[PDB]
Write an enzyme that holds these catalytic residues in place. Structure first.
Site, short mmCIF file in Angstrom:
data_model
loop_
_atom_site.label_atom_id
_atom_site.label_comp_id
_atom_site.label_asym_id
_atom_site.label_seq_id
_atom_site.Cartn_x
_atom_site.Cartn_y
_atom_site.Cartn_z
N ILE A 228 1.05 -1.31 -0.11
CA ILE A 228 0.48 -0.34 -0.28
C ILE A 228 0.95 0.91 0.17
CG2 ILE A 228 -1.09 1.22 1.51
CD1 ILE A 228 -2.57 -1.37 2.07
N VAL B 175 3.87 1.55 -1.15
CA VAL B 175 4.51 1.67 -2.07
C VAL B 175 2.99 2.84 -3.85
CG1 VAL B 175 5.07 0.76 -4.28
CG2 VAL B 175 6.61 0.40 -2.45
N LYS B 176 1.85 1.79 -3.41
CA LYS B 176 1.14 2.91 -4.11
C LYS B 176 0.92 3.56 -4.06
CE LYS B 176 -1.04 -2.35 -4.87
NZ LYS B 176 -2.69 -2.46 -4.61
N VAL C 30 -9.45 -2.31 -1.81
CA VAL C 30 -9.32 -3.20 -1.01
C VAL C 30 -8.37 -4.16 -0.75
CG1 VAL C 30 -10.33 -5.00 1.12
CG2 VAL C 30 -12.32 -3.51 -0.28
N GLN C 31 -7.36 -3.98 -0.17
CA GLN C 31 -6.17 -4.88 -0.08
C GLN C 31 -6.11 -6.11 0.23
OE1 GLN C 31 -3.32 -3.84 -1.60
NE2 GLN C 31 -1.57 -5.00 -1.17
N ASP D 205 -9.20 -2.09 -9.16
CA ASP D 205 -8.77 -3.00 -8.94
C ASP D 205 -9.04 -4.42 -9.78
OD1 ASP D 205 -5.98 -3.88 -7.04
OD2 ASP D 205 -7.01 -3.78 -6.39
N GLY E 246 6.14 -5.98 -10.08
CA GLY E 246 5.95 -5.28 -8.96
C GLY E 246 5.90 -3.93 -9.16
#
Ligand SMILES: NC(=O)c1ccc[n+]([C@@H]2O[C@H](COP(=O)([O-])OP(=O)(O)OC[C@H]3O[C@@H](n4cnc5c(N)ncnc54)[C@H](OP(=O)(O)O)[C@@H]3O)[C@@H](O)[C@H]2O)c1
Ligand SMILES: NC(=O)c1ccc[n+]([C@@H]2O[C@H](COP(=O)([O-])OP(=O)(O)OC[C@H]3O[C@@H](n4cnc5c(N)ncnc54)[C@H](OP(=O)(O)O)[C@@H]3O)[C@@H](O)[C@H]2O)c1
Ligand SMILES: Cc1cc(C(=O)N[C@@H](CCC(=O)O)C(=O)O)ccc1NC(=O)Nc1c(N)nc(N)[nH]c1=O
Ligand SMILES: Cc1cc(C(=O)N[C@@H](CCC(=O)O)C(=O)O)ccc1NC(=O)Nc1c(N)nc(N)[nH]c1=O
Lengths: 286, 287
Positions: free
Chosen positions: B51, B53-54, B97-98, B123, B267
């Site tokens: 999260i 990194v996002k 939602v991760q 997503d 990634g």
């Protein structure tokens, strides 16, 4: 020579069980009956035949099946009025649009199909039910009728699916693509082929289980068949006589089990629709 | 040996183009800005890492990204209240939602994911968006971000996908299953493998394109790889020593024509594709 998978016989047994459930369900609940609606656009000859076979099966079982046939000059908005009404009529437990739509106007098939309430989508063609089956949520969705029926034909062989290589030729929305998902979540290793597959013959040869739904008469030759494969032929083609997508004569020598055309997948398709209709009628009683 | 598919370099190019895209939108429509929300349940370290990194990538591009983190003890009814609020906030263009949820209570992941409005499902995890992708109706749906990024890495080779035999190892809802669909509607012949596949080495050896997403470190041995294969490693595995992928990179690099390193491969492409989808829903919202 392969043992023949007798779909005409297997479906008959299914429909008898459905009739008993519908008979029993009409007592436990007096005045109640599963109700199916089938919507048709245009007047294709093959659509007429398949719809009538479905009406015929529904009659035998006790399901009340209506057939609304709209003219070729029907507009997309005219079709949406019927889907809206059927969605809202609480006496209708399942309905479906026979495909393809035979209209001279431009109608977005995907838009029409996806207006169907998912809980009435007994054909399993909405994106909602397809997305559940595609992601392995099988106990929550209606599964398309021809795939459901092919799966039952495969179990009739007694040969477990888990760990076998399944080849599916064709990726259509109604048969090939949901057939891939069904085999996968039944834990086969699955290869999907289609009209851009190179060396289709060598790909078909990998299949312990082979499901052919291409609409090309007898294009899948018997030499291509892996020895001892379970061969499932979804084709129904009218040719110089009715033939499937698998050259039946040669393939019977290599297959361990094979579906003939006619009397294989076809009746199973119809029986599985009746089963999904009874399932939605039961779900409605909650 | 293989050319390295360098995800760091390619992702950096996509973010820059996105940044300039946002700048021009903001010039054309002053005040407007793409808005992302990330919902998390629990306090998993890896989710915290991903999260973050996002968040960094969104900040670089000019996407306003908010992060809402709920405790391990939340109820499904609490999570549903937040999802509803995000669905209803007209200033939020996409949210995710991760996964996985980290909860003491059992929470229906499928019920939670499926309450997201499909038009904000950046997503691509709602059943609606999955069903569109699974049936080739690719112009109306968000595609999940890791398969989107694998597809870009494969297209970087300049070798057409149509006609090739692609092998996807793994069938998860976030990676493996949508990857199979993406490759199929790019006209590959696709074989999907999983933990019930027998003779996995022989299935892998069929792949002109190989995408591995198993979470089983280095389990796909390089000797299985077909010579000249395009190898995509979605694995991020922390092993004692270090990050490794799902493919034995050493032997695999000797045989592939192209290969993604771990890390610096899939990634960063995952994050960049999420930003691309966010910018896309913001543009659609302007329409
Ligand atoms: C139900 O089918 P439909 O009404 O959708 O008919 P259709 O448009 O011909 O499609 C039937 C399915 O069979 C495939 N197919 C057609 N010719 C083929 C060939 N020579 N080799 C392999 N696959 C082939 C098609 O591939 P495509 O999906 O590549 O057209 C399609 O997925
Ligand atoms: C990130 O993203 C990647 C994918 O993770 P995820 O979200 O997909 O996690 P996940 O839900 O654990 O999915 C793992 C997938 O890999 C498959 N798999 C596990 N062991 C296997 C084996 N020995 N042979 C073949 N398939 C095997 C599983 O098969 P089943 O579906 O049969 O469990 C499953 O489909 C990982 O590499 C991780 O680092
Ligand atoms: C191909 C087919 C055959 C038969 C059948 O009964 N075949 C018997 C001979 C019957 C006789 O002549 O008595 C046999 O092959 O032995 C029934 C059904 C279909 N197919 C469909 O109906 N497909 C379909 C569709 N086009 N659109 C929607 N929405 N849903 C659908 O399921
Ligand atoms: C595994 C992973 C790694 C990275 C990453 O940062 N990798 C780089 C570092 C540099 C950089 O990323 O810029 C590298 O490995 O080289 C980002 C994202 C994920 N995966 C996810 O986030 N998965 C996921 C999920 N669990 N749940 C939902 N809903 N959606 C999802 O997409």
């Amino acid at each position: 020579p392969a043992e023949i998978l007798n779909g005409k016989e297997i479906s008959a047994q299914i429909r008898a069980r459905l009739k008993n459930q519908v008979t029993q369900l009409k007592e436990q609940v007096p005045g109640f009956t599963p109700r199916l609606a089938i919507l048709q656009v245009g007047n294709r000859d093959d659509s007429n035949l398949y719809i009538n076979v479905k009406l015929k099966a529904a009659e035998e079982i006790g399901i009340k099946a209506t057939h609304i046939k709209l003219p070729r000059t029907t507009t997309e908005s005219e079709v949406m009025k019927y889907i809206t009404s059927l969605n809202e009529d609480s006496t209708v437990h399942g309905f479906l649009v026979q495909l393809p739509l035979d209209s001279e106007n431009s109608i977005n098939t995907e838009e029409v199909i996806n207006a169907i309430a998912p809980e009435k989508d007994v054909d399993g063609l909405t994106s909602i039910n397809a997305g559940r089956l595609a992601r392995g949520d099988l106990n929550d969705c209606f599964i398309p009728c021809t795939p459901k029926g092919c799966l039952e034909l495969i179990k009739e062989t007694g040969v477990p699916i888990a760990g076998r290589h399944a080849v599916v030729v064709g990726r259509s929305k109604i048969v090939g693509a949901p057939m891939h998902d069904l085999l996968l979540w039944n834990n086969a290793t699955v290869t999907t082929c289609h009209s851009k597959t190179a060396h289709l013959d060598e790909e078909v040869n990998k299949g312990d289980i082979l499901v052919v739904a291409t609409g090309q008469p007898e294009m899948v030759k018997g030499e291509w068949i892996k020895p001892g494969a379970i061969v499932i032929d979804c084709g129904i083609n009218y040719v110089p006589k009715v033939v499937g997508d698998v050259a039946y004569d040669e393939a019977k020598e290599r297959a361990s089990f094979i579906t003939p055309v006619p009397g294989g997948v076809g009746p199973m398709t119809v029986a599985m629709l009746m089963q999904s209709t009874v399932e939605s009628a039961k779900r409605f009683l909650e």
